[PDB]
């Protein structure tokens, strides 16, 4: 499951986490097994005009 | 007239009552947790901790 997220909320992708996206868009199970990968996308997913 | 002649049965009854009473009393103990009542710690903290 892949998407793009704001920088300050990267810590919210974890079991038992509360925030803006944690309980409104994407919530992981408490017993989730697997891995999470986060990397930068400034050079491609950012525009000078926004 | 004279009392205290039936010590064995009274002792048995007292032992049973005391054991039940202390078993009930053990509920209020903390055991190192935040509180001795489940509802308070449920409504005060989210599940993960």
Swiss-Prot record, chain A:
Result when mutating residue 43 to K: In strain: Omicron/BA.1, Omicron/BA.2, Omicron/BA.2.12.1, Omicron/BA.2.75, Omicron/BA.4, Omicron/BA.5, Omicron/BQ.1.1, Omicron/XBB.1.5, Omicron/EG.5.1
Effect on the protein of changing residue 8 to N: In strain: Omicron/BA.2, Omicron/BA.2.12.1, Omicron/BA.2.75, Omicron/BA.4, Omicron/BA.5, Omicron/BQ.1.1, Omicron/XBB.1.5, Omicron/EG.5.1; complete loss of interaction with host integrins
Function: Attaches the virion to the cell membrane by interacting with host receptor, initiating the infection. The major receptor is host ACE2. When S2/S2' has been cleaved, binding to the receptor triggers direct fusion at the cell membrane. When S2/S2' has not been cleaved, binding to the receptor results in internalization of the virus by endocytosis using host TFRC and GRM2 and leading to fusion of the virion membrane with the host endosomal membrane. Alternatively, may use NRP1/NRP2 and integrin as entry receptors.
Residue span of region Integrin-binding motif: 6-8
Name listed for the protein in its UniProt record: Spike protein S1
Source species of the chain: Severe acute respiratory syndrome coronavirus 2 (2019-nCoV)
Annotated consequence of substituting residue 48 to P: In strain: Omicron/XBB.1.5, Omicron/EG.5.1
Subunit structure, interactors included: Binds to host ACE2. RBD also interacts with the N-linked glycan on 'Asn-90' of ACE2. Cleavage of S generates a polybasic C-terminal sequence on S1 that binds to host Neuropilin-1 (NRP1) and Neuropilin-2 (NRP2) receptors. Interacts with host integrin alpha-5/beta-1 (ITGA5:ITGB1) and with ACE2 in complex with integrin alpha-5/beta-1 (ITGA5:ITGB1). May interact via cytoplasmic c-terminus with M protein. May interact (via N-terminus) with host bilirubin and biliverdin, thereby preventing antibody binding to the SARS-CoV-2 spike NTD via an allosteric mechanism.
Top-level taxon of origin: Viruses
